[PDB]
Design a protein around this ligand. Structure first.
Ligand SMILES: CN1CC[C@]23c4c5ccc(O)c4O[C@H]2[C@@H](O)C=C[C@H]3[C@H]1C5
Lengths: 215, 212
């Protein structure tokens, strides 16, 4: 039952410092090298370096010598990597992985830790109804624009409408997030009946109910 | 500082044999590079498959095997399973550095191909009031999950203010995504016909509307 558990997501400001942990279980932690890897969109995978807990010996990708520091605790069976002077280029998902000598490779990987280095402030979204251009089915929607940070939740008719719902992944539009959700219902239920989307943005603690009305 | 190159993408069907390669810019890959192959499935879930060129990691299915083909390292997956869809990365040890390839996105066709359903929404009156206009193009039920979107205003291509999401799986296992075209309300009033066209597997599905 070999497992490596890493610390949760991090949101840091430029110039700060973060310490990512990697807890091992199911094996003798001091006897295996622990690799650290950086995954940034459009940059595939970079090897930061590695550490052997038993000896404390390390090996760094020269490019990361002044950025990362490796530590380990054979008492708590945990390895850590600290990244200093954070910049936007440090934003990515970091992984620790076990290297086994006789195998000559990395077998078990941690789940990864998402580091977001930003100076953006919490911003509530604007919610706008999406109605058809005025078939057996009809699709209605809601636009959730300009919020930060993720996420937002969208339900229809307070959850009473669940089937036929499509809440899409968000995308960045000028440094803020934009998301949309749609619901497809029988053409006979709308406008016949009411359809309301309920949007919530926990971070800004904002909630908006917008009824979809024929244009 | 060798550069490791892998095929960007490959598609296979269940039961088939597929072969992935890993090349070094330094030269022929040798057993001294301890070629590794790791697998990343949705929600960035990594796990090692091959180490030291041909050693298979614990618990890894026998259908996975590593070898060298010519001057490159290779990963062979026999009797491909739908669960084998993932991004496969190779890693080579050279110059005291572990270098990763850019990864190969393997698609395993686990369901019938499906053209997308496109729906186009005009800007809401409430938004226009803020001197803003966002058209929303929803794209659902497509497979494989790869599409390109093109917007046109009165027949002419427009990309400014345009953003398109990454595709994601729906509950029925097909894919969905959306695209947005945002203009100022004043600009939205300077055009008549708006069109969202989605190309999938070499076939374009179009949806349009008129402002007035
Ligand atoms: C990826 N990383 C794993 C650990 C270590 C190593 C490698 C190969 C064979 C070894 O026996 C071995 O042990 C250490 C170290 O001595 C030298 C290089 C490093 C490198 C590659």
């Amino acid at each position: 039952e070999v497992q490596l558990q890493q610390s949760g997501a991090e949101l840091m400001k430029p110039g700060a410092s973060v310490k990512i942990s990697c807890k091992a279980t199911g094996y003798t932690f001091s006897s295996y090298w622990i690799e650290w890897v950086k995954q940034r969109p459009g940059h595939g995978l970079e090897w930061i370096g590695e550490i052997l807990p038993g000896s404390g010996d390390t090996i760094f990708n020269e490019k990361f010598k002044g950025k990362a520091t490796f530590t380990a605790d054979t008492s708590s069976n945990t390895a850590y990597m600290q990244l200093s002077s954070l910049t936007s280029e440090d934003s990515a998902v970091y992984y620790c992985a076990r290297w086994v000598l006789d195998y000559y490779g990395m077998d078990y990987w941690g789940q990864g830790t998402s580091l977001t280095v930003s100076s953006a402030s919490t911003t509530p979204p604007s919610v706008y109804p999406l109605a058809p251009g005025g078939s057996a089915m009809v699709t209605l929607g809601c636009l959730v624009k300009g919020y930060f940070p993720e996420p937002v939740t969208v339900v229809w008719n307070k959850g009473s409408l669940s089937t036929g719902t499509h809440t899409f992944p968000a995308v960045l539009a000028a440094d803020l997030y934009t998301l949309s959700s749609s619901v497809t219902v029988s053409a006979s239920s709308w406008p016949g009946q009411s359809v309301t989307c309920n949007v919530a943005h926990p971070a800004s603690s904002t909630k908006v109910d917008k009824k979809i009305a024929p244009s | 500082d060798a550069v490791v190159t892998q095929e960007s993408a490959l598609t296979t069907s269940p039961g088939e044999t597929v072969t992935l390669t890993c090349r070094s810019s330094t030269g022929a890959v040798t057993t001294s590079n301890y070629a590794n192959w790791v697998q990343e499935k949705p929600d960035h879930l990594f796990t090692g498959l091959i180490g030291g060129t041909n050693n298979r990691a614990p618990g890894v299915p026998a259908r996975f095997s590593g070898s060298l083909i010519g001057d490159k390292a290779a990963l062979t997956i026999t009797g491909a399973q739908t669960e084998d869809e993932a991004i496969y990365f190779c890693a080579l040890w050279s110059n005291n550095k572990l270098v990763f390839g850019g990864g190969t996105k393997l698609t395993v066709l686990g369901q019938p191909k499906s053209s997308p359903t496109v729906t186009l929404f005009p800007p809401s009156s409430e938004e226009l009031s803020t001197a803003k206009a966002t058209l929303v193009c929803t794209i659902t039920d497509f497979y494989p999950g790869v599409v390109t979107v093109d917007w046109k205003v009165d027949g002419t291509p427009v990309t400014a203010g345009m953003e398109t999401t990454q595709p994601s799986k729906q509950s029925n296992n097909k894919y969905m995504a959306s695209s947005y075209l945002t203009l100022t309300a004043r600009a939205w009033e300077r055009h008549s016909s708006y069109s969202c066209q989605v190309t999938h597997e070499g076939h374009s599905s179009n949806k349009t509307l008129s402002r007035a």
